[PDB]
Swiss-Prot record:
The chain holds residues 26 to 87 of 158 of the full protein. It comes from the Eukaryota. This is Rhombotin-2. Its main location: nucleus. It is found in: Nucleus. One of its GO terms (molecular function) is chromatin binding.
Amino acid sequence: GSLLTCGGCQQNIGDRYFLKAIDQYWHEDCLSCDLCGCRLGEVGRRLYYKLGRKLCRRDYLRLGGSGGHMGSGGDVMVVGEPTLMGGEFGDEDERLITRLENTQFDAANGIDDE
Ligand SMILES: [Zn+2]
Ligand SMILES: [Zn+2]
């Protein structure tokens, strides 16, 4: 039933896996980005968010940072590589949420629990 509550849909996390870090709990497909429209970086480490926004550093950099361009990343030769392309970098200290498991991870119904 109801174990944790996600801050994205707030419909409770009865899943087997779940994500959390900001200050509350989330969902795997709920914890998305605000403005870039990506999916941060689900490699548990640090996290980047504002007072009341789960907005990226690059998102924050797009309006109140130093970017606001198309070419994102570090200024390096364009060979078709991730991150390093322009100026609005990536993560490292960004929303690297910890992909955790639920206490009732059981999963009595496959990708659905009781
Ligand atoms: Zn949710
Ligand atoms: Zn973003």
